[PDB]
Amino acid sequence: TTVFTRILDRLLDGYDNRLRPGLGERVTEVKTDIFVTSFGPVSDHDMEYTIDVFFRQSWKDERLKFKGPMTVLRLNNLMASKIWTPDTFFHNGKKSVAHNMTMPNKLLRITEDGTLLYTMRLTVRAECPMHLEDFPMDAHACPLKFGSYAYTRAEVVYEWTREPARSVVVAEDGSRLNQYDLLGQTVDSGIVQSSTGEYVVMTTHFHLKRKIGYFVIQTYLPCIMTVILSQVSFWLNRESVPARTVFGVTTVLTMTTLSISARNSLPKVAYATAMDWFIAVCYAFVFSALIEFATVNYFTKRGYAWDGKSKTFNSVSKIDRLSRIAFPLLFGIFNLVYWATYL
Amino acid sequence: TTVFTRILDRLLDGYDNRLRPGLGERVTEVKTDIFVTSFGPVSDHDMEYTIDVFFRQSWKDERLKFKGPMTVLRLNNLMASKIWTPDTFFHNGKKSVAHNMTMPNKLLRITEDGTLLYTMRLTVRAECPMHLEDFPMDAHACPLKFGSYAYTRAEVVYEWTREPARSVVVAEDGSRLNQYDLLGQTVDSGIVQSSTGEYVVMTTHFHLKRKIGYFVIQTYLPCIMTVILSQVSFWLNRESVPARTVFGVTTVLTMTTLSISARNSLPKVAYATAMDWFIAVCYAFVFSALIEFATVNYFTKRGYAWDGKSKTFNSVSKIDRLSRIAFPLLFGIFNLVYWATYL
Amino acid sequence: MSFVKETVDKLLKGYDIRLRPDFGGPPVCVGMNIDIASIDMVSEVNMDYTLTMYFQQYWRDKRLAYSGIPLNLTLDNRVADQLWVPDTYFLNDKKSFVHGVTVKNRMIRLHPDGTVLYGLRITTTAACMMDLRRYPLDEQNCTLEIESYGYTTDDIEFYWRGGDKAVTGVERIELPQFSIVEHRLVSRNVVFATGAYPRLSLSFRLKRNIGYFILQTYMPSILITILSWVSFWINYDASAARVALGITTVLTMTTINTHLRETLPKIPYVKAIDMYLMGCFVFVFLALLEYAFVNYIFFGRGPDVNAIDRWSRIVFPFTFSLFNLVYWLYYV
Amino acid sequence: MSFVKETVDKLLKGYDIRLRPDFGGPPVCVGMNIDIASIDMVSEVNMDYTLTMYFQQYWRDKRLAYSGIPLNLTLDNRVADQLWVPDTYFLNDKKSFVHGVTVKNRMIRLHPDGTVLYGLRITTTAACMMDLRRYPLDEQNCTLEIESYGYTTDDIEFYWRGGDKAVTGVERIELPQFSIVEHRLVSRNVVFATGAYPRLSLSFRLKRNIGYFILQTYMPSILITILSWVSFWINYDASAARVALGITTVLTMTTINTHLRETLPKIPYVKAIDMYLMGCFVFVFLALLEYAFVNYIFFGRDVNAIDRWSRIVFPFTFSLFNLVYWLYYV
Amino acid sequence: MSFVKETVDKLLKGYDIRLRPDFGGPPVCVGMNIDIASIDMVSEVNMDYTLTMYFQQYWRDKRLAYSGIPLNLTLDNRVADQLWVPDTYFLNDKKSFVHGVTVKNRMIRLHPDGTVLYGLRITTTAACMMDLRRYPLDEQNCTLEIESYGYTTDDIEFYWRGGDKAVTGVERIELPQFSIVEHRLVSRNVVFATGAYPRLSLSFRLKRNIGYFILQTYMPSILITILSWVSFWINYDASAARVALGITTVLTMTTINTHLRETLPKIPYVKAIDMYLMGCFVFVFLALLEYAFVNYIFFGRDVNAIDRWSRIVFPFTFSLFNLVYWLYYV
Amino acid sequence: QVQLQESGGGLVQAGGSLRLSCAASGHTFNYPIMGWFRQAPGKEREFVGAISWSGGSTSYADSVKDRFTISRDNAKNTVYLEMNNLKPEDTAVYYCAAKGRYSGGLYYPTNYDYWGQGTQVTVS
Ligand SMILES: *[C@@H]1O[C@H](CO)[C@@H](O[C@@H]2O[C@H](CO)[C@@H](O[C@@H]3O[C@H](CO[C@H]4O[C@H](CO)[C@@H](O)[C@H](O)[C@@H]4O)[C@@H](O)[C@H](O[C@H]4O[C@H](CO)[C@@H](O)[C@H](O)[C@@H]4O)[C@@H]3O)[C@H](O)[C@H]2NC(C)=O)[C@H](O)[C@H]1NC(C)=O
Ligand SMILES: *[C@@H]1O[C@H](CO)[C@@H](O[C@@H]2O[C@H](CO)[C@@H](O[C@@H]3O[C@H](CO[C@H]4O[C@H](CO)[C@@H](O)[C@H](O)[C@@H]4O)[C@@H](O)[C@H](O[C@H]4O[C@H](CO)[C@@H](O)[C@H](O)[C@@H]4O)[C@@H]3O)[C@H](O)[C@H]2NC(C)=O)[C@H](O)[C@H]1NC(C)=O
Ligand SMILES: CCCCCCCC(=O)OC[C@H](COP(=O)(O)O[C@@H]1[C@H](O)[C@H](O)[C@@H](OP(=O)(O)O)[C@H](OP(=O)(O)O)[C@H]1O)OC(=O)CCCCCCC
Ligand SMILES: CCCCCCCC(=O)OC[C@H](COP(=O)(O)O[C@@H]1[C@H](O)[C@H](O)[C@@H](OP(=O)(O)O)[C@H](OP(=O)(O)O)[C@H]1O)OC(=O)CCCCCCC
Ligand SMILES: CCCCCCCCCCCCCCCC
Ligand SMILES: CCCCCCCCCC
Ligand SMILES: [Zn+2]
Numbered sequence A, B: 001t002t003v004f005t006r007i008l009d010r011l012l013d014g015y016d017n018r019l020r021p022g023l024g025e026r027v028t029e030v031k032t033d034i035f036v037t038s039f040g041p042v043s044d045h046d047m048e049y050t051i052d053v054f055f056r057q058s059w060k061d062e063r064l065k066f067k068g069p070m071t072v073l074r075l076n077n078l079m080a081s082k083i084w085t086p087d088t089f090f091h092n093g094k095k096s097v098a099h100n101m102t103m104p105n106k107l108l109r110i111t112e113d114g115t116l117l118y119t120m121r122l123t124v125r126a127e128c129p130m131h132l133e134d135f136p137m138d139a140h141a142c143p144l145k146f147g148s149y150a151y152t153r154a155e156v157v158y159e160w161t162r163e164p165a166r167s168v169v170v171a172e173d174g175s176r177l178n179q180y181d182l183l184g185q186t187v188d189s190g191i192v193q194s195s196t197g198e199y200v201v202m203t204t205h206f207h208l209k210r211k212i213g214y215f216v217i218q219t220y221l222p223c224i225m226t227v228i229l230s231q232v233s234f235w236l237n238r239e240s241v242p243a244r245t246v247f248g249v250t251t252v253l254t255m256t257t258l259s260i261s262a263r264n265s266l267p268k269v270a271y272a273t274a275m276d277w278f279i280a281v282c283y284a285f286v287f288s289a290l291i292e293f294a295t296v297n298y299f300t301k302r303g304y305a306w307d308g309k310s311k312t313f314n315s316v317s318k319i320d321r322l323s324r325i326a327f328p329l330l331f332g333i334f335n336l337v338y339w340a341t342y343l
Numbered sequence C: 001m002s003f004v005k006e007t008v009d010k011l012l013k014g015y016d017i018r019l020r021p022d023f024g025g026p027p028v029c030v031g032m033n034i035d036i037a038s039i040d041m042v043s044e045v046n047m048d049y050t051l052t053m054y055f056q057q058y059w060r061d062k063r064l065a066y067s068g069i070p071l072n073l074t075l076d077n078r079v080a081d082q083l084w085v086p087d088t089y090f091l092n093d094k095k096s097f098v099h100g101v102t103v104k105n106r107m108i109r110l111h112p113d114g115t116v117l118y119g120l121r122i123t124t125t126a127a128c129m130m131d132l133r134r135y136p137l138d139e140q141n142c143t144l145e146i147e148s149y150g151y152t153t154d155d156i157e158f159y160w161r162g163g164d165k166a167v168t169g170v171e172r173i174e175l176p177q178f179s180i181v182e183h184r185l186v187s188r189n190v191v192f193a194t195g196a197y198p199r200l201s202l203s204f205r206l207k208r209n210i211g212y213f214i215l216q217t218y219m220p221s222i223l224i225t226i227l228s229w230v231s232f233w234i235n236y237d238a239s240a241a242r243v244a245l246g247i248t249t250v251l252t253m254t255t256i257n258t259h260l261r262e263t264l265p266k267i268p269y270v271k272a273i274d275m276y277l278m279g280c281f282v283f284v285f286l287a288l289l290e291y292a293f294v295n296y297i298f299f300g301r302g303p304d305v306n307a308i309d310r311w312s313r314i315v316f317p318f319t320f321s322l323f324n325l326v327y328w329l330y331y332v
Numbered sequence D, E: 001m002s003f004v005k006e007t008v009d010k011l012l013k014g015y016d017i018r019l020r021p022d023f024g025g026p027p028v029c030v031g032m033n034i035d036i037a038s039i040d041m042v043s044e045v046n047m048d049y050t051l052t053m054y055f056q057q058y059w060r061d062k063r064l065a066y067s068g069i070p071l072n073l074t075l076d077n078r079v080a081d082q083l084w085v086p087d088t089y090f091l092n093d094k095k096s097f098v099h100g101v102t103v104k105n106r107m108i109r110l111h112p113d114g115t116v117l118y119g120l121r122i123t124t125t126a127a128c129m130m131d132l133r134r135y136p137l138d139e140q141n142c143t144l145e146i147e148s149y150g151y152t153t154d155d156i157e158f159y160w161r162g163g164d165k166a167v168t169g170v171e172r173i174e175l176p177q178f179s180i181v182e183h184r185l186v187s188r189n190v191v192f193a194t195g196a197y198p199r200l201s202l203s204f205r206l207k208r209n210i211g212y213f214i215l216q217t218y219m220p221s222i223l224i225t226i227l228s229w230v231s232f233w234i235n236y237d238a239s240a241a242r243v244a245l246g247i248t249t250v251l252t253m254t255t256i257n258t259h260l261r262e263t264l265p266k267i268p269y270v271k272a273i274d275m276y277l278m279g280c281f282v283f284v285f286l287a288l289l290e291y292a293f294v295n296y297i298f299f300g301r302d303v304n305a306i307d308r309w310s311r312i313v314f315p316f317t318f319s320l321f322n323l324v325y326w327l328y329y330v
Numbered sequence F: 001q002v003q004l005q006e007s008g009g010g011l012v013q014a015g016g017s018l019r020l021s022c023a024a025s026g027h028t029f030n031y032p033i034m035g036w037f038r039q040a041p042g043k044e045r046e047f048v049g050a051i052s053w054s055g056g057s058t059s060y061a062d063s064v065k066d067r068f069t070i071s072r073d074n075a076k077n078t079v080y081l082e083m084n085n086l087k088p089e090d091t092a093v094y095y096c097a098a099k100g101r102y103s104g105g106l107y108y109p110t111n112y113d114y115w116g117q118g119t120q121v122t123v124s
Helices: A002-011 A213-236 A240-264 A275-298 A316-343 B001-010 B211-235 B241-265 B274-296 B319-341 C002-012 C077-082 C213-234 C239-262 C272-300 C305-331 D002-012 D075-082 D211-233 D240-262 D270-299 D303-329 E002-012 E077-082 E211-233 E239-258 E272-300 E305-330
Strands: A028-043 A049-062 A071-074 A088-090 A107-112 A114-128 A139-148 A157-161 A168-170 A180-194 A197-210 B027-044 B047-058 B074-075 B087-089 B094-100 B106-111 B115-127 B140-150 B156-160 B166-171 B180-193 B198-210 C028-043 C046-058 C074-076 C087-088 C095-100 C106-110 C114-127 C138-148 C156-160 C180-191 C196-207 D028-043 D048-060 D088-090 D093-098 D105-109 D114-127 D139-148 D156-160 D178-192 D194-207 E027-042 E050-059 E086-092 E091-096 E105-108 E115-127 E140-146 E156-160 E176-191 E196-209 F003-005 F019-028 F033-039 F047-052 F058-060 F068-074 F077-086 F092-099 F111-114 F119-123
Touching: A002 A071, A028 A197, A028 F047, A049 E305, A114 A139, A114 E091, A139 A157, A157 A180, A157 B180, A157 C114, A168 A180, A213 A240, A213 A275, A213 A316, A213 C239, A213 C272, A240 A275, A240 C239, A240 E239, A275 E211, A316 D002, B001 B074, B001 C095, B027 C196, B027 D303, B087 B094, B115 B140, B115 C028, B140 B156, B156 B198, B156 E091, B166 B180, B211 B241, B211 B319, B211 D240, B211 D270, B241 B274, B241 C213, B241 C239, B241 D048, B274 B319, B274 C213, B274 D303, C002 C074, C028 C138, C028 C213, C077 C106, C087 C095, C095 F019, C114 C138, C156 C180, C156 C196, C156 D240, C213 C239, C213 C272, C213 C305, C239 C272, C272 C305, D028 D139, D028 D194, D075 D105, D088 D093, D105 F047, D114 D139, D139 D156, D139 D178, D211 D240, D211 D270, D211 D303, D211 E272, D240 D270, D240 E239, E002 E077, E027 E115, E027 E140, E027 E196, E050 F092, E077 E105, E086 E091, E115 E140, E140 E176, E156 E176, E156 E196, E211 E239, E211 E305, E239 E272, E272 E305, F003 F092, F003 F111, F019 F033, F019 F092, F019 F119, F047 F068, F047 F077, F047 F092, F058 F068
Parallel strands: A028 A157, A028 A168, B027 B156, B027 B166, C028 C156, D028 D156, E027 E156
Antiparallel strands: A028 A049, A049 A114, A071 A107, A088 A139, A107 A114, A139 A197, A180 A197, B027 B047, B047 B115, B074 B106, B087 B140, B094 B115, B106 B115, B140 B198, B180 B198, C028 C046, C046 C114, C074 C106, C087 C138, C095 C114, C106 C114, C138 C196, C180 C196, D028 D048, D048 D114, D088 D139, D093 D114, D105 D114, D139 D194, D178 D194, E027 E050, E050 E115, E086 E140, E091 E115, E105 E115, E140 E196, E176 E196, F003 F019, F019 F077, F033 F047, F033 F092, F047 F058, F068 F077, F092 F111, F092 F119
């Protein structure tokens, strides 16, 4: 124990933690990898996603070489704060959390050679800009970028510990998504220029695709059935004015109920998504079905219907006879164009 | 001011704040009283309440005796953290705030005898489990328990400063409740046994009673008037089939609108309360009224009503004549049984 | 207190927190028990629950053994910062904190043999993946995973102190929406490339209560569907009555479904509740569509009618019963 | 800079933050002035408002007197942690903080004669018990109570530094739902069994804007109630038309009433708006009953008289109901 | 390596952080530039917006000049606690923080002459008082006020570093509901009771996207209004049909108005959308009220005359209402 | 920008009353606080009064208090200065000024962005 204890007290002798390793001598190379324990929920309203990770960083500091019985030292949390570590941050982070229960969820190890392995457990909220034009049939690439806040690429460079594809690992039970499928990810790195210089940026994109089954049973199917129900009025006799007026006006109120609820589910954007157009067209169809009867009723001559046992009677409207074909056909065509366009 | 300054330095000379007063010698007796500045809002959804208090604790520490011109000493916040104070906590607390604006809202006074008076201004959120089966006619006793976190009754014992009833005082204007009436409070003390030992617990129960006038005018009366309206249909003539079908069906939709909104006010609990049962019965009465007319119409023969001058005409349905009595009476009986049960 | 002060100061003189008990020796065994205070919230949207508990850890440290005092020394909680404690953490916790009013809700209690009792009052929001396909008839299994951040089983070993009696307070938990059916304690050693790591799991089985959904969702939907069948008993010539009945039931059914979408916890995929509401919507849709057929055959193709209604008076009640049997058998 | 550096080190050297100025002598007089930044929110559900302000305290400390420098030393905010400051707190304050970006929003300014100026930028949520019986025609009075924690008037005194001008920035307040009608400053001593404690109170009176509720609540209810009277002008034998009108007005009125319950801030007791909506609901309920009586007295057993009578009584009684309502609430 | 370590030690040896550079001399000039990472929320309910930016400050501190090191010293951000930094704050911010994962997002870079570059990553919620009379056809102007808390213009002066290029990233911002039409940089002095203070203002002009509201809010109301005129083309004697159409379109209009969440029910004062929805509500109200006259003036006592004119007046008057409305609000 | 023009000035006998109107057009919402100043023949501009956007709040100079009042009409974008019990000292050019939402105190002319060409009021 004494041999182990002496090394720790000796390590920070003359060590300046305000200076990065190899200052003014070379570039400090940081090898990093991520293990995503759970790709947390994605928020369309906030355009952000949560991600729980074990963020791992490795680099070399010659000032921390040591000799002794053991080849690896586990520094204390107080010791870890006495030495220089990379100032890695997330470029698109919104409000991240470093877990501190029951102790700080961090660990810093030192090998005899001066190699530091540094791990921490983080919950990161990150920005994921979403273009919801094709909603609910949209896909997104949510990014995760990080790098040094203060050190330009001439000072600190980041790299992946192994092949970039094998450096970000997601747990098999990590997907905590209700409305998305995690198709996969791509891992890259590059350079970013800002007002303070050029910096190395390590990037990861999570490719997400929205599940559509919810919206078919909630929005599309009821809307389609309401439109079908508005056309069923064309098959009622023209003399039943109160029945076909109630049919048409109340189908309009049903579309309004469906149409309003569909938007309340949408994130508060101010452009027309795919579902907006489908609802608008369904509204026009149901609107046009009641306008059609206004024309049919305008040419009905007799207020009584055929009595079943035959005095002249109204003929079946030519507006109704054609509408029985034009309305189903036009709506059918609109569905092929809509569903082929977006799928 | 020198005499005052010297005493402060001498007090903490050799004082060990890791050891409670009388450790291994006697039982520390802490005298507590509470002044409730405001009994904050109660959240039925979260099943918690807020309470703003001046929490006062008094005990004796012979290690802090002194002699000087004064008899009472005020300790700075830095000085207060240098001595031993009870580790009091609230058992049902959820998240509590010790106010720090502009300075820490604490005060530690020491008398030459060695007695310490220690007051702090706190805002406490506490768990108040509620049995909402009688909602909106339910009453609750929201508790507030506290004691030592680490010291068993063999080490620290809590007592109320004066008569337990008079030790907790609620400011006259301190009731900040919207839907409750603070009937009163009962102050008790006892022993609670856990896995670590026996501990003293001080308990205070605030008895709340929900104000019902809101739900009478928002839920009960509209439901009662809609049920009455569904029965007015029995008095229409049996030949007005469209009117009595529209009458009965729209009262079902009106009840649905009332039922949907009535449960929004209720906390999102998965069991049935007293307001749900009242609405379910009103739903059944409105549903049955429309089924009543379906049976009346089945036995209607002539499609024309009485002409008003006198050819035969339908007779007033015996189902209607009986339904004009049975339906009002059965609803009347349900109300007496319902209200006498819950009031 | 003079003798105790000497003993306490003696133990901490030269104490090295950076080194574990029996450093370089047999792994230190840390016994744990939990006293659950409440399970505050269970949110399907966030897929997590909030848990307040008293979290105790027991281990023996011979560096802290003391003799001559027949007492267990409870020390001011701030002394915990001067001792070595396990690097225990909750693997699936999202947000957690130690309560801090009036002081930090923390306890250190030494024992003559060196046993250390270290207790915290923790409120932790823990991630719980939920399978809500059978909602509201679903049963959930939420867990709490306890692991050592740094050490392996060569250094530190976990066990439930008291076996199945380690966790207490479950029977007193009340949830407005669920009921605790069971809880289990599991001890295991997860294996990675680095090595074996201690793991303790506390899991609860939650069975959702059904009373609210029966009265609020299933019962209203059933009654509206039965009401739509009233049209089959009205004369075919009463077009204004049967259409108003038929279309108003369609409107009523959408009102239930659209309003029972913003109140419910926004789970965007097809659940059991969605299927039942959709099925009832189809039945009222078909009941209205039936009269269109009745009207057309008489008025349209007239230049039979009672057969369609008479047949509808049986098939619709029968098929709805068949639909209900399949639904409840499949989901129960 | 060294001369001033040694001048400052001279002041703090030997300073005792644990003793108030003029310890054991006359009470230290603390003047206070507030520059109000905004009232961000006023919530009826929680019954409180959020206030941002610059809170300034001004007193004299002889131990901080410095000579030779003809300037008022503006120092770094971190020097505030090395001086004595008053233990002022806000009695009705639910939650508050000092802004901390980029640095802690705190100011210390010394003067040669030992006078200390101490400014803090504070956002505080203060409890305001509201009487919402007349809502939305209600007028609220929300205060801020300033008090000493552990001093009596024998040790510390409070006053509004500048009289009625001690508080500025009231014209900056822009509440969408209210308008500030008035504000007052009160200085008083609160006497308990333990002694007398200085108290300062700042209070605002708020008048709620009614225009939104005219368009959103009252006007739709009036037009629906009038629409229910269209039944009285239709034939007594148009049962489907008159029942559909009456029953659909009832459904429309419930829709207005139930959905307004969701948009408004959930105050669970009877208010002025509740009494008006229930009044209009009863009127449309009675109009539908009027036709039931007309239909029954004809087919079940004059008829034109009841409609003629209803054409006058309903509009007249509704006007009387409005007259009684607005006088009793305006 | 020790030579650099020794150099840094010399600078901080005896360094006084309570005294600004050139204390008592000319004011220290602080230059600022901002890189805007994103604008996240722009809420009308809270009348604020969130802003994540990289905030840089440049000033010259002779006490921090060093020689013999031909490099700019980027230092561990924890050295910022050992230096004087401007007491800059955002005068209109509601709540803000400096990001702290994995470490505090803070940068200190020195230059040989003594220039200090102090960068922070800040997310700030700033108050933006929005004018919602013309909503959703409204244009907003949101500002960010940057001011010194304690120091007057005699001590500290601000300037945008790089002129109008001092703020970058605005072109990249995407808002779900607005478009950044323009942004401006202003520099001025504000005079208070305690003296003049330097001010830097950054402001944006936001134009709301109107296309969405046309399909969601305006179009459905327009169609329902046209539907209510179908009554004028039905026989006067079809009382059941015309009342059902009239009262059901009134119900539909209430349905649209009640739970159209794009109406902003949480902000209670009159907006342009409110006027239009009530304009359409009045029209459907009158279309059903017109039938009371038509039905009465036939059965209660020309009958085709009222319908004949309504077929023109209602379409014509509604277009006149639309013309006046759009011109007034556009 | 904002454009301000004052009106209503003239000659009034001492002890009488007068009303001044200030008409504002432009981005009046960006400059919600309207302040009234007066320029004596020899002295500098002196603060007279101010009024908020809603108009429920107002402030006046000590000497001018209890004689002058300020009212606002956002519908017509006009602020009025009802002056009562006029005195010979009140003779001065009364300016109308508009202040931004974050411009400091009311009594300092430098904090107001836009000014009108003040109408003249002389008391005999
Ligand atoms: C609630 O609010 C209170 C204050 O009202 C907070 O407590 C204060 O916290 C601040 C820090 O945030 C304290 O300020 C510190 O004061 C120290 C005083 O030094 C004492 O000891 C030395 C040495 O014996 C004596 O010479 C001296 O006279 C004093 O007796 C300073 O030393 C500190 O400066 C150090 O840290 C700062 C900041 O990093 C550095 O800039 C300095 O260089 C130096 O390293 C510091 O100024 C203040 O004293 C506290 N007040 C009290 C009464 O304790 C609470 O923290 C707050 N609670 C919560 C939960 O927020
Ligand atoms: C959102 O709304 C805000 C108001 O709330 C607008 O802010 C105003 O912006 C204008 C510019 O568009 C500012 O006006 C400019 O002020 C500059 C600084 O003035 C100071 O310094 C001068 C001396 O140089 C002093 O006289 C003065 O008192 C100040 O101390 C001026 O330099 C500018 O002058 C320019 O125009 C004038 C003519 O008006 C020319 O004579 C000059 O040569 C020069 O071209 C100019 O006056 C104004 O101060 C801002 N107001 C506030 C309250 O900050 C935002 O512009 C708006 N946002 C958007 C995007 O529109
Ligand atoms: C939104 C639709 C707008 C349509 C606007 C259309 C407006 C328009 O001009 O309509 C006129 C007519 C309506 O025909 P419809 O069949 O409805 O009405 C018959 C028609 O009026 C005959 O002329 C009558 O016989 P007669 O000889 O007078 O004795 C006959 O009386 P009865 O003997 O039976 O008692 C009526 O029933 O329609 C077309 O010709 C086009 C049909 C295809 C239109 C396809 C439209 C999709
Ligand atoms: C939910 C209701 C369920 C009811 C289930 C069904 C119950 C049931 O049996 O209904 C039919 C029957 C008749 O009802 P109702 O009076 O409507 O029908 C009359 C009846 O059919 C006569 O026989 C007819 O005369 P006639 O002989 O042809 O000359 C007469 O025609 P007309 O001379 O006017 O032209 C019809 O109007 O009702 C009862 O006896 C009430 C039982 C108590 C029901 C009490 C219910 C509260
Ligand atoms: C303080 C509690 C007040 C509760 C008021 C409840 C009133 C219930 C009245 C029920 C009347 C039913 C009449 C049915 C007539 C057909
Ligand atoms: C956006 C402008 C829409 C105008 C609609 C006018 C309809 C008039 C129908 C006669
Ligand atoms: Zn709704």
